[PDB]
Amino acid sequence: AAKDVKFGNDARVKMLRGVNVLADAVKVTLGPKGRNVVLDKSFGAPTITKDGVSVAREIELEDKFENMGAQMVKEVASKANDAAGDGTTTATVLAQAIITEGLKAVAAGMNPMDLKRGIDKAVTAAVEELKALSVPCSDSKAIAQVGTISANSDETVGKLIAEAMDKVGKEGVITVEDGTGLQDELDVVEGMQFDRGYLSPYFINKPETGAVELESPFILLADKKISNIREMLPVLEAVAKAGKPLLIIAEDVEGEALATLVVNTMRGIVKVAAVKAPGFGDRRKAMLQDIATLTGGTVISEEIGMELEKATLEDLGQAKRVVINKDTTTIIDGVGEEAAIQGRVAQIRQQIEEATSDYDREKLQERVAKLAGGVAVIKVGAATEVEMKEKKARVEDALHATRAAVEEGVVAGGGVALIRVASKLADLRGQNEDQNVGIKVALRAMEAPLRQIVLNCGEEPSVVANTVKGGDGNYGYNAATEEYGNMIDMGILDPTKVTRSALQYAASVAGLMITTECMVTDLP
Amino acid sequence: AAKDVKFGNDARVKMLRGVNVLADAVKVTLGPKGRNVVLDKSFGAPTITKDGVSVAREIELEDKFENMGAQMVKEVASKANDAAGDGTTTATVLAQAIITEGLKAVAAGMNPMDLKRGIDKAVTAAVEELKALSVPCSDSKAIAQVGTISANSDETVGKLIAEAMDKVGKEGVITVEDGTGLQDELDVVEGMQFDRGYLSPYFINKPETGAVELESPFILLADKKISNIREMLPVLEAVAKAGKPLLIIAEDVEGEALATLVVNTMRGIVKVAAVKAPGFGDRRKAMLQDIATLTGGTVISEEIGMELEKATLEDLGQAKRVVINKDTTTIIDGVGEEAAIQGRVAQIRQQIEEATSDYDREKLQERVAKLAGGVAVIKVGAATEVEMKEKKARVEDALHATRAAVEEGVVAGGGVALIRVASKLADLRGQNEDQNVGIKVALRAMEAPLRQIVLNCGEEPSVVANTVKGGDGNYGYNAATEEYGNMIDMGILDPTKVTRSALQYAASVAGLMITTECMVTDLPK
Amino acid sequence: AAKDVKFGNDARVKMLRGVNVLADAVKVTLGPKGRNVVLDKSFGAPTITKDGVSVAREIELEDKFENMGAQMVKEVASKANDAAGDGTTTATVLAQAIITEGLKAVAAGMNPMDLKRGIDKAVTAAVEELKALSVPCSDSKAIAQVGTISANSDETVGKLIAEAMDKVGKEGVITVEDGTGLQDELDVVEGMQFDRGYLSPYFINKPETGAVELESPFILLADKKISNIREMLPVLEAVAKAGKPLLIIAEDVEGEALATLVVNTMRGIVKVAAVKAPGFGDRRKAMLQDIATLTGGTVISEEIGMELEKATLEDLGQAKRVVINKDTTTIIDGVGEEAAIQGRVAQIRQQIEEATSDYDREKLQERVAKLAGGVAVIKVGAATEVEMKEKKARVEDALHATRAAVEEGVVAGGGVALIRVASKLADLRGQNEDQNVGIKVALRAMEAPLRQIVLNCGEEPSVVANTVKGGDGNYGYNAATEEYGNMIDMGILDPTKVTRSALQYAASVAGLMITTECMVTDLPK
Ligand SMILES: [Mg+2]
């Protein structure tokens, strides 16, 4: 179709205007004195929320160019939330700040490519300063504290997470499920987790978490690319009987097969979800068998001459529950016999001895860690179903935060960490004046979050920001109590991973937009 | 789709304008000299009403932003009516008053978050003053009085409610049905009520009450999530043959199953209604058995390996009637044998003795109270079908009012209780000046109801309000007779729960709107 | 959908404008020198009429608010014609007069609620004065006279009505049918009448009378609520084949069932009409059996386990004709055997002796009076089919008038009675000045009919009205001859019931509109 093309300043202003609508809408929720955004549903009453992620999802602009701007930031900003479980709003506010001053510079005559390099240099330096500022989170006491803070000052949640990580380890797999009663429960069952998400967002049945949950499902393991639904009929019919869901783990599911599964599942004829098999090549084949042993199913490999038509319900494995999000799949409580699993673990351990390559050994060590490690299951208990679902949510969110804290520690929150690191990089310079401007653009942008928080509180941002720079370390401003002091001590903190990711992603898109000269889109 | 986004004052003014249309439309009905609102019907002659709930339901604005404003207040204002069975109009009037003055403050430069905190502080204080002002409602004489006042001065209704609560108790289950003749009747039968509503508003067969009524139905008790319709075909066909309705009480009914039941029931092939099982976890399993013992049915537990395909009519329980609304389900007159029920009641109290914690005992005591407590059935009688339906409505309304009165008591009506509480909170302060303004915004807003009532009567609100503040206690202005005195004595009162709910919900939305900076909605296209 | 909301004066003026279009269109036909209204029918040549009811039915306005006004008056005004068989036009003219002056007062600053109270007080007083002015109508001579006057001075009709009422009594059921020839006939057959009308105005096949007539129809008796058409399939596919209509007498017919019957009947696939069963509760069940015994049908009671699917033609009762209007249903000449009916009559008479209550006896005595009383059938004869249909209409019209005359007597016509009563209530006062105005508004409005009649004649209304007030009793102005005198003697009169109903209904709607502050309707979109 005919396209509308824009260039230079004309394009960049449109791009900016779009980013402002997005940022301006989300940054009102930032801070403890965050404001409400009203999202219309036109079926029932409007939604009132302080969740910047919810707001972002709704933002789409009529102007095609302005929209492109908002959609570029949204995409990248969401990755920050996918990595650390927080920081999408922060990333958006940072992006705005960098782009605004960035474009001002470009208009002044600065070279866009140099500006970008200057920004990136300021960020790499800022990340290194974050590491130095970071406070470790290792002992269980600390883990419980971070969990409590992330759970809205609930000591219970902090304890649960601490106990869970003490059972499966810090790199261990932890899941959260509904409680059967009032008392909380913690068990370690046979399970595994691999880095593969849903092949279609239409499999999502739990929109709140944005994940797919399957209760007592069958698991199909095929070492083949499924493109047609013809070969699935015999298996789908067998699953349609006994009325249980189906998880398809194949090399890939595409074309008709995917489409049919997407439709049939949304119609509610047969609940089905599909994900790619973990890894690639030889490793993929081996891990499919791990899942088979674990779920007590058989892998349908066409390599040995097996066909999907002759796949019976006995060939399918099964587990108690399966959770699938955009990136990960978790199999919980496989029916696989203890003898079979311990048998394959010992088999792989034998392969570790025969390993010639270091790489080969590391990959095997990873697979045994999964099979032997198992999965921790936290059943959240409460007195009411409403209280139970609510607490469950806080546990899941606090879990992600605590995990991130264990990886890279914690730094002062309330946007202090960013303004702190920026203050330490005053003498940072680049190869030319344009790069120097890029650095200053980034350093000034790192004040955006704090300033915004202070603004929402109704205080003078410039004064607070000025005072915070005066201090050192994790000294900052507690926007909630209006008192200055050690942010970590006052309980206002963020996982260093969050702040890091937010900044890096923010700078990523900001850098791309600053170096854009042409935009192509459809006509109105 | 592309969205229209507004910010700051631009958004808040739009939001306000929408709230004014809603409020200005409903507040004309407030008071004993309230005016009529004419609601147009797509087909037929228009409706003339003084019911602010009926008016509110119809309010929808063309402007997307203004509409969002009206819909936010409607939603929250409705919850006051769901809690106490009255106060939707009051909550709307309050909301308007708080938002109006609240936004004026925001524009003046006040911090919205402080304004909200100041309002909330004034409300929490106002609620405490309401409790103090409240007059308890315990003795049957009082219950009859409140029931009479709520029934438009009909002593008959007051007596009926009093007698009913004297049989099943104050926390007992009371239901109302159509009369068979002129004589009113009251009977207590084997029954139970649990906090679970319909799973689809398309099961509603009685749109008037907005509930589902099933006559002599079968009850299916399955401890499983039904998602497919394949597994009930055998049961549905067996129920299609006895030509009787079916109540499905399962862990949950969703997907195709729900859809098919929604369609088939609206087509009239088989009358069916579905609700979730009460509670969750282990307690859910136990209560499903309580229903089973009561209805004389058997629970189809997949845990022990039972299937729904092998479910016969003998496995289904049955009662005389089932009433299901958005929140509650009531089973009336179960076929369960007296020996079976009394047997399980004794079993549970055995469990009360073996109970280690207090929580476990309280929860078991709750289940025995349901099984043994039974259900009171009030058949409203009259000389004409029209008069019978009319009186039935007054009994149902007066019942909800009386219940609310037994919970938190009664306070002066006519909007006096609010203006009274407000006058006692003149010295209330907050942490800063902004919060202090928030407090004054709330205190001035609590005069809105009275002022509006007086206005509808054609008298000077500022004079009446000024006189009422001069007095103490439940001293106020009877808008009907235009005389001052004790409102309780004059018979102008409201359940303390009503006034409280109305205020708290009104302040809830008002606080949210005052602290709104952004609104997102679709384009006029 | 988005709504358009108006308030206060803006709403009331819209309402008024709509009432004016209605009133101004119908009031041109009022009086003996009434004018013609030309109604377009879109299929053929236009209709020319002086029937204000026909005109009103056609009135629908483009402006949604104006329309609401006209539709409110139409609704209430029609009830006057349903009660006394006349007075819709009068009620409309009165309504206009009250609303016009009423709103003028509201705009002046008068309190709407007081204005309404003042009006109502003036009306109750006016009705009492009407009773005093009323002249009884008891003896057959008087009945014949009133019938003659109502039949446009046809002594024949007067005699027919007199003879008919002499057979079945004054409170007896009288029906009118087409004649077989020139000679008129009068017979008493097995029949009954109960106070239940059509469930949908789309069943009407005789738009002239606004009723439903079914010839040699089958009658379905079910003591259940029919909501689905599925259960009707077997019975319906047995009526169309028979080539006969179907009358459904059930507890109620609603939802799909009603809709399907409304459509199918208008398509002409199967002629069907539905009405509710008489009474409620236990009494309803008993009366449904009375109809069964009378029509020679069997009741399908689900209580004993009968289903509507297993209903055969043998289960259905049948009569020679059925007449259904908005309020009443009349079964004429049932096929029920004399032995069966006389058997149940004696059975009920036995229950009268065992009756403990007075109320119970009175209700049973009503049941027997219907079954034993029967129905009088008047076959109107003439020399031509045209003359026959024409006379039949006058007989039906004169019948309704005469019945109303027997109930409350007759008063001066030509709008004299109203202006007479008004002149006697000059000293009537209220509690305050606002109510006093309301009274004067009503008294001045009672001159509207006369003045309009005089206007249509081309005379000065103010002069005539002034002269009529000068006299006393039933002294008035015969607009036809332009002579003053005793209106009753000159043969210009109206059943007291008509004038009463017209005034009361007129004041009812007027009172509601005067107390309206808000109107809600859809947008022009
Ligand atoms: Mg007539």
Curated annotation (Swiss-Prot), chain A:
CDD domains: GroEL
EC number: 5.6.1.7
InterPro entries documented for this protein: Chaperonin_Cpn60_CS, Cpn60/GroEL, Cpn60/GroEL/TCP-1, GroEL-like_apical_dom_sf, GROEL-like_equatorial_sf, TCP-1-like_intermed_sf
Catalytic activity entry: ATP + H2O + a folded polypeptide = ADP + phosphate + an unfolded polypeptide
Signal peptide range: none
Database matches in SUPFAM superfamilies: GroEL apical domain-like (SSF52029), GroEL equatorial domain-like (SSF48592), GroEL-intermediate domain like (SSF54849)
Alphabetized UniProt keyword annotations: ATP-binding, Chaperone, Cytoplasm, Isomerase, Nucleotide-binding
A Gene Ontology molecular function term of the record: ATP-dependent protein folding chaperone
Subcellular location: Cytoplasm
Principal location class: cytoplasm
One GO term describing the cellular component: cytoplasm
Entries under Pfam families matching the protein: Cpn60_TCP1
Binding sites annotated in the UniProt record for ATP: 29-32, 50, 86-90, 414, 478-480, 494
Single GO BP term: protein refolding
Keyword field contains Oxidoreductase: no
PANTHER family, sorted: 60 KDA HEAT SHOCK PROTEIN, MITOCHONDRIAL
Subunit text: Forms a cylinder of 14 subunits composed of two heptameric rings stacked back-to-back. Interacts with the co-chaperonin GroES.
Role summary: Together with its co-chaperonin GroES, plays an essential role in assisting protein folding. The GroEL-GroES system forms a nano-cage that allows encapsulation of the non-native substrate proteins and provides a physical environment optimized to promote and accelerate protein folding.
Family: Belongs to the chaperonin (HSP60) family.
Name recorded for this polypeptide: Chaperonin GroEL
